[PDB]
């Protein structure tokens, strides 16, 4: 069948910039192509069909083109809500295959993580568990590292980290770090420290409670 080969895999550009996502069909597809944007947790949205026709209700900044085996999405004057995935889809013949996608992140000025830490809820302590949590909200770039120093000593056991996706207005990220201990162990240590090291300052952000 005709295999869609999409590029580039991951992309970073800033607001105001012009970008181009290219899709190369193994075989000729005579303009039977369509582009989508899938935002995290939502259904893929169609942008343009039949290679060049832009869908109604879709911004003029999204221009589509191509001929033969080469086709490419063009985003002139990028905007903050343009982050997401873009899939080029073929439907010349069966099976109608999808390209591998493009993770488009939005280049923005750097920003430091504003952090906060929370001791375990009174309620949880009785279940036989203790979860110390720390939220490092709103930073950019995504690279960031937090270390849990229990009584002044590093612990890396039972820590769960999760991150959100780029905000719609500001393009930043947030992360939640969770060190889960047994009620017993939590009770036999005092200071609990969520220390984070970003790229915006050389001296690490520290937030801790003594209990």
């Amino acid at each position: 069948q005709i295999v869609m080969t999409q590029t580039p895999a991951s992309l970073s550009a800033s607001v105001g910039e012009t970008v181009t996502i290219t899709c190369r069909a193994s075989g000729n597809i005579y303009n039977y192509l369509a582009w989508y944007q899938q935002k995290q947790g939502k259904s893929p949205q169609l942008l343009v069909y039949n290679a060049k026709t832009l869908v109604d209700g879709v911004p003029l900044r999204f221009s589509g083109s191509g001929s033969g085996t080469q086709y490419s999405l063009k985003i002139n004057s990028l905007q903050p809500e343009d982050f997401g995935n873009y899939y080029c889809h073929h439907f010349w013949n069966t099976p109608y295959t999808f390209g591998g996608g493009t993770k488009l992140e939005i280049k923005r000025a750097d920003a430091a993580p504003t952090v906060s830490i929370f001791p375990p809820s009174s309620e949880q302590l009785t279940s036989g568990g203790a979860s110390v949590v720390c939220f490092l909200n709103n930073f950019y770039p995504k690279d960031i590292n937090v270390k849990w120093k229990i009584d002044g000593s590093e612990r890396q056991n039972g820590v769960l980290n999760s991150w959100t996706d780029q905000d719609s207005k500001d393009s930043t990220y947030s992360m939640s770090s969770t060190l889960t201990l047994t009620k017993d162990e939590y009770e036999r240590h005092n200071s609990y420290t969520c220390e984070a090291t970003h790229k915006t300052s050389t001296s690490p952000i520290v937030k801790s409670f003594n209990r």
């Binding site: 259904s43 899939y87 099976p95 109608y96 999808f98 949590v133 769960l160 999760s162």
Partner: protein, 216 residues
């Protein structure tokens, strides 16, 4: 209006079979081609096959030929997809769409697992009495110990919008853990009531937990 409504989320032992339904409201199925798209968690879009409901003929991708079967009945105007001999490899979100200018269905979640349903336990995250007499405060909610997906967290019954971040769930011994934060100004807390509300449909469980200061 005109839109496709897909069925609800599923929880199945492996080896089991499912039959998902996709409804067309305000338009007639028989006049279009309908296709289904699969999407493994964190992965991309796979086309399953298309169907023309009129003549009842469907075209699949060889990878799904012996796993999926698209069937369309114009009478109730509902299109279906049946999955056979489920395996972990089939746990994903399924989409329903028409080959034209119309938005696809919201998709259906099919979680294949031996793990039985388990309601979460939400613990409220109140700070340890530190200088909270500064512009904005950050409250938290930690939802954990539930299966399957998805849970829903909102703040003060959906009224608190700006400042909330619900981070994605993650497995542990086949149990998820998720958590949400909200940044309300120092003034509103606690001069007003901020509460974390979470609904886990799979177990007909909803839980409200009032974020309140820690004592002594």
């Amino acid at each position: 209006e005109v839109q496709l409504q897909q069925s609800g989320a599923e929880l199945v032992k492996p080896g089991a079979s499912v039959r998902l339904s996709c409804s067309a409201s305000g338009f007639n199925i028989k006049d279009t081609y309908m296709f289904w798209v699969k999407q493994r968690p964190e992965q991309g879009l796979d086309w399953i096959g298309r169907i023309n409901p009129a003549n009842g003929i469907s075209k699949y991708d060889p990878r799904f030929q012996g796993k999926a079967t698209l069937t369309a009945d114009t009478s109730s105007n509902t299109a279906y997809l049946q999955l056979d001999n489920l395996t972990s490899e089939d746990t994903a979100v399924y989409y329903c769409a028409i080959e034209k200018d119309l938005p696809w269905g919201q998709g259906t979640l099919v979680t294949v697992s031996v793990a039985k349903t388990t309601p979460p336990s939400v613990y409220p995250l109140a700070p340890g009495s530190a200088a909270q007499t500064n512009s904005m405060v950050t409250l938290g909610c930690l939802v954990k110990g539930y299966f399957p997906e998805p849970v829903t967290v909102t703040w003060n019954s959906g009224s608190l919008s700006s400042g909330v971040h619900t981070f994605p769930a993650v497995l542990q011994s086949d149990l998820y853990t998720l958590s949400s934060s909200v940044t309300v100004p120092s003034s509103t807390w606690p001069s007003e009531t901020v509460t974390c509300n979470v609904a886990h449909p799979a177990s007909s469980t909803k839980v409200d937990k009032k974020i309140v200061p820690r004592d002594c």
